[PDB]
Every structure is written in structure tokens, then in C-alpha cells.
Write a protein that binds this ligand. Structure first.
Ligand SMILES: CC1=C(/C=C/C(C)=C/C=C/C(C)=C/C=O)C(C)(C)CCC1
Length: 133
């Protein structure tokens, strides 16, 4: 369990193109997406999270309560319907997205004033680091 509240500015993004490719996102959207800075805003009131991942092209907003399974519609990404559950494994927030894609989900944790995010889909891992502003 840990405080992840804040505005976080991207400082690193490794193999985002491989992750988008495992999601079958098209060539044109990917080439534009891989070059953009992302900012993440997170408001955390206990077990309720409101998140926004912004970039000039397109944004992605995801709200959820820890430990309550829900239906996520990945609109603006691959636009699939997945069954999502986010839980705490120590101070990593762990998300599994059950559906057609194998091994799909993410892990998010803080160290110092950096937010680390690991995104998985199939055999592809994408590593991102953001710094709190
Ligand atoms: C593919 C893609 C995007 C990235 C989406 C990601 C991967 C969202 C992650 C959300 C999570 C993990 C939030 C938890 O803190 C953008 C930048 C919207 C632009 C359009 C294409």
C-alpha cells in the first residue's frame, strides 16, 4: 500500500513499440505514439484511484477500486473488453487484465520521487519511469 498521488512527468519509456505491437496497434498510431511525452495525474483516496495518462495525441483515463473486479473497455488503445483486477503486493500496485491477450497487465510502484510502471502483453515488457513534479 503506498502513496502514488501526484503529477508525474515521463523520463523514460523502453520498448513501448513492442508493447503496442503485442496489442496489434497499427503502424501509423504507433510511430506517432512512441515519440510523445506522457504525463500521469493520479488522485488516490484510500482504495479509490482516479488516473489520467495524457499526451498531445490522445489520453487514457482509468478509475478503479483496489480489490474490486471490473469491466475495462480499452478505448483509444486496442479497444478490447478485459476483466480487470488491481491489488497490492506489498507496495506494488498489480493489475491483471484477463481476456484474449495472454500475460496482459501492469505493475506500478514508487521509489524516492520516481514512479515505475511495467506494462506486459504476451512476451513484451515496457518499462517507464516518471518523476513527480
Ligand atoms: C497506446 C496509447 C497510449 C498509452 C496507454 C497506456 C499504456 C496507458 C496506461 C495506463 C495505466 C497503466 C495506468 C495506471 O497508472 C496513449 C499514450 C494514451 C496514446 C494513444 C496510444
Amino acid at each position: 500500500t503506498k502513496d502514488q498521488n501526484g503529477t508525474w512527468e515521463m523520463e523514460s519509456n523502453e520498448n513501448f513499440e513492442g508493447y503496442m505491437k503485442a496489442l496489434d496497434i497499427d503502424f501509423a498510431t504507433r510511430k506517432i505514439a512512441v515519440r510523445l511525452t506522457q504525463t500521469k495525474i493520479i488522485v488516490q483516496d484510500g482504495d479509490n484511484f482516479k488516473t489520467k495518462t495524457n499526451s498531445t495525441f490522445r489520453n487514457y483515463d482509468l478509475d478503479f477500486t483496489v480489490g474490486v473486479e471490473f469491466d475495462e473497455h480499452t478505448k483509444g488503445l486496442d479497444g478490447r473488453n478485459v476483466k480487470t483486477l488491481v491489488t497490492w503486493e506489498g507496495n506494488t500496485l498489480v493489475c491483471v487484465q484477463k481476456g484474449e491477450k495472454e500475460n496482459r497487465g501492469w505493475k506500478q510502484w514508487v521509489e524516492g520521487d520516481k514512479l515505475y510502471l511495467e506494462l506486459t502483453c504476451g512476451d513484451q515488457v515496457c518499462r517507464q519511469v516518471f518523476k513527480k513534479k
